[PDB]
Ligand SMILES: CC(C)C[C@@H](NC(=O)NCc1ccc(F)cc1F)C(=O)NO
Ligand SMILES: [Mg+2]
Ligand SMILES: [Mg+2]
């Protein structure tokens with residue numbers, strides 16, 4: 109296909125200074141008239157003027173009021189408008205076009221589209237070209253004057269970026285509104301919305317300059333009651349950027365708008381952030397707990413882009429991580445601050461080490477700054493986002509808070525109102541590093557390898573203690589596996605946050621310190637170490653790596669009980685589970701392949717189980733943390749450690765381990781499930797959509813995790829508890845009652861009960877679909893067909909499609925049915941969805957990413973479905989690129 113390379117970046121021959129748009133919405137067409145005030149740059153060599161413009165119907169084209177004609181002065185092929193160089197002026201000129209577009213049939217949700225009864229845009233990355241002609245790349249910065257007109261009854265609220273400077277009536281029951289956005293921007297940050305929207309509003313006064321900012325949050329009328337928590341989260345986001353980063357908002361007004369049909373979470377259009385409704389709307393009677401967290405993070409994220417993305421933007425799309433990795437890091441700092449729970453940071457680590465590590469070991473592996481693409485849209489990945497964020501976070505670990513803040517301000521101020529590159533960020537952080545080291549020859553040149561080198565480093569350790577000298581050494585090695593991006597991998601700058609625990613008394617033996625590993629291996633020596641320690645390594649998960657702790661399970665148990673760092677405690681537990689999972693998996697696999705009539709399994713370590721019980725019974729230990737220790741590692745995590753994985757053998761492995769532990773702990777689990785009830789389900793704040801007690805939410809999470817364990821175990825009379833739980837006013841509880849009832853005859857009664865509770869709220873119904881989809885049912889295939897026929901039907905809403913299918917794809921036993929029927933079902937959905945929404949179709953490909961990790965029968969079945977999809981006529985460039993890369997053809 110058509111491949112863009114990072115190395116070939118060149119500035120344009122043209123400049124666009126001002127954009128003046130009139131967008132006239134009618135029932136069966138929208139007319140877009142656009143004037144671009146343009147000029148020739150210093151890089152111009154008299155080339156043709158080529159605009160991006162996809163699927164536009166041309167009404168008229170002119171330059172300086174001279175009409176241009178197709179075949180004579182221009183060509184248009186439905187993708188690019190070429191104005192021949194003879195007709196391109198040599199100094200400042202006005203380019204005029206008028207085109208017709210059709211939001212009402214735009215089911216791809218990119219460009220201008222209709223979502224229920226709201227007209228909305230999505231322009232990042234390449235959507236502005238589906239609205240009007242432009243040099244649609246992020247270095248083409250301009251100022252925008254936008255007029256929107258529409259039928260007043262249908263579309264009473266009209267929004268675009270920036271200050272509303274006029275509103276006017278138009279004959280025939282229409283009206284208009286004009287916007288001026290004074291901030292220079294790329295076209296990917298343009299937005300318009302038209303709808304019958306309702307709002308909540310508040311005034312925010314900025315901390316330093318005392319600027320009054322009007323905050324509006326919008327939804328369709330039915331769901332206006334679900335806007336309050338978003339507004340609160342916006343205030344929190346603003347205060348956080350003021351308090352931590354010294355950054356104030358820069359317009360008089362900020363609008364946030366929920367729409368039902370959206371490809372991803374939300375979008376940072378200047379002054380007009382647009383959200384998937386699932387990431388803006390909640391109410392405590394109609395939303396699960398996880399919604400509150402999601403809204404907090406997504407509102408935060410879009411808000412933080414106002415500097416990291418908007419005020420400082422991208423030179424080109426290869427720099428994507430500069431805005432997304434950095435914004436996710438800001439969002440994560442914010443979330444950790446607002447929730448004050450250790451499970452926040454653990455949740456980010458869990459996501460990285462499951463999904464992103466899988467990606468990084470797959471044929472899709474890329475560095476956080478890719479070298480090439482066909483469709484830029486395929487690079488909005490957990491690598492670019494989540495590994496990017498960890499790369500952005502490592503600067504803070506290396507520098508500390510004070511020097512990190514200095515470097516960040518160098519960056520943000522130097523590049524204000526302009527484009528930037530990853531190098532500019534690394535240069536700013538390098539100035540801070542020099543200051544920190546008090547050495548103007550220190551450099552971060554090695555650090556750039558985190559942007560250019562793909563793959564996850566493996567860091568391993570060896571320890572030695574000299575009792576006579578009271579001297580302890582940690583010898584560290586790093587390795588990155590060669591891959592298609594680099595045949596020779598170089599050592600990275602890896603910060604290793606470390607503590608040392610005395611195993612006798614469980615106490616800290618050193619000031620926490622950060623080891624700076626820069627070579628392939630190094631030995632770090634500590635004096636005045638009074639007894640042999642147990643090391644507490646990569647505290648806070650200080651780099652995005654595979655950690656090989658080389659600790660015994662006895663040492664791991666001591667850290668789990670006694671270490672200060674929540675990640676090291678969690679990882680020590682993770683490691684004990686992984687050792688057991690790999691050992692039992694190999695035992696089961698050998699028995700199966702050798703057709704043994706009898707064999708042995710290694711039992712779960714009894715001292716580890718005792719440790720779990722000790723933590724669970726400690727009334728002062730954290731409820732969220734407890735829910736992580738009784739859960740095995742996620743399947744996507746486990747699979748990074750197994751080649752030729754037999755998923756059935758893995759399923760049997762996990763069941764054996766869970767059963768071993770429950771045989772010891774179920775009575776503890778039951779006692780805690782009951783004892784936590786009063787505090788977990790207390791109704792303090794149940795009517796307050798401005799405040800969430802995240803500790804209490806983690807108590808519900810722990811109850812629900814325990815209830816699942818006990819239900820799968822068939823603990824005596826647990827069905828009574830399941831039925832009581834379905835009467836709870838918390839949706840998290842009553843939907844958990846449905847999933848845990850899977851193990852009982854009462855499942856279809858709870859299916860109906862909860863359906864009735866969910867069906868009248870669009871977002872709650874989607875959460876019910878996910879609950880059904882992930883249910884541990886032998887008849888799941890018949891249940892999915894019932895969802896398709898009775899609920900999903902012909903929906904093109906990405907949230908409905910994702911809700912029905914993705915959870916099911918995580919059913920290890922059923923999705924990977926050795927017949928291949930799981931792979932076939934999802935491939936049919938992908939191909940169907942690709943005919944109207946290529947981005948969503950590529951999202952639905954997610955289960956196939958691990959195909960070359962599976963046993964060879966399942967590899968063959970997956971491959972056969974991937975190649976079937978590839979053969980589909982009129983396959984999108986998005987899906988075709990994804991599948992060609994994934995199957996080692998590109
Ligand atoms: C171009 C914009 C639309 C990308 C947006 N990314 C984003 O929302 N990711 C979350 C996400 C949510 C739902 C989903 F199904 C898939 C996703 F990748 C983001 O970074 N917003 O700032
Ligand atoms: Mg069209
Ligand atoms: Mg997030």
Ligand SMILES: [Mg+2]
Nearest residue numbers: 368870903905
């Ligand atoms: Mg709907």
Ligand SMILES: [Zn+2]
Nearest residue numbers: 409413432435
């Ligand atoms: Zn973003």
